[PDB]
Amino acid sequence: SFSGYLKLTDNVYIKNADIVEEAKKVKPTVVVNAANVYLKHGGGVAGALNKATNNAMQVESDDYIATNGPLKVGGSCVLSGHNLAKHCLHVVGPNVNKGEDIQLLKSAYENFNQHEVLLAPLLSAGIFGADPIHSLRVCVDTVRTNVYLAVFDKNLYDKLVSSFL
Numbered sequence: 604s605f606s607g608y609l610k611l612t613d614n615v616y617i618k619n620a621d622i623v624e625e626a627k628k629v630k631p632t633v634v635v636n637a638a639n640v641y642l643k644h645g646g647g648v649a650g651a652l653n654k655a656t657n658n659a660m661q662v663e664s665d666d667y668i669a670t671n672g673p674l675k676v677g678g679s680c681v682l683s684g685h686n687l688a689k690h691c692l693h694v695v696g697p698n699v700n701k702g703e704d705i706q707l708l709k710s711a712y713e714n715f716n717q718h719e720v721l722l723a724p725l726l727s728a729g730i731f732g733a734d735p736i737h738s739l740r741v742c743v744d745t746v747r748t749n750v751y752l753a754v755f756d757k758n759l760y761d762k763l764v765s766s767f768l
């Protein structure tokens with residue numbers, strides 16, 4: 604199962620790891636994708652997860668959007684995890700770079716509570732533009748299920764652990 608994680612709280616764990624490499628190693632029940640409302644997996648975590656599936660995630664996502672329309676910011680959908688996990692929980696955190704309400708980050712993390720254990724990135728962090736320290740705080744204060752956070756950047760991982768209240 605999950606190895607090398609630092610325990611932050613009763614249910615939140617963190618590791619400096621590439622979430623794609625982590626998913627291929629663990630093959631968890633649920634891998635969280637840092638999705639956008641259109642499920643267009645172009646860059647950041649979404650582009651990396653999609654590239655690991657040889658674009659199968661994008662093909663499946665386009666069929667999902669054709670049938671259902673876009674997700675809401677703060678919302679999610681469960682799709683296949685392909686070669687990475689049993690399922691992928693595509694969660695839309697607010698993109699601060701697209702002027703979205705950072706207050707929707709708590710709503711985005713609430714989606715994690717529908718799954719007993721998840722491998723996940725910090726929502727709205729990276730190319731989504733939010734402060735990752737704030738994202739970790741919202742995560743620990745919102746998620747009650749077991750969440751294994753993979754932080755790609757070593758320097759950001761160190762800052763997150765060393766500043767964790």
Ligand SMILES: Clc1ccc2nnnn2n1
Pocket residue numbers: 621622623647648651729755
């Ligand atoms: Cl290739 C790659 C892998 C992991 C990751 N996390 N954020 N961006 N990113 N990109």
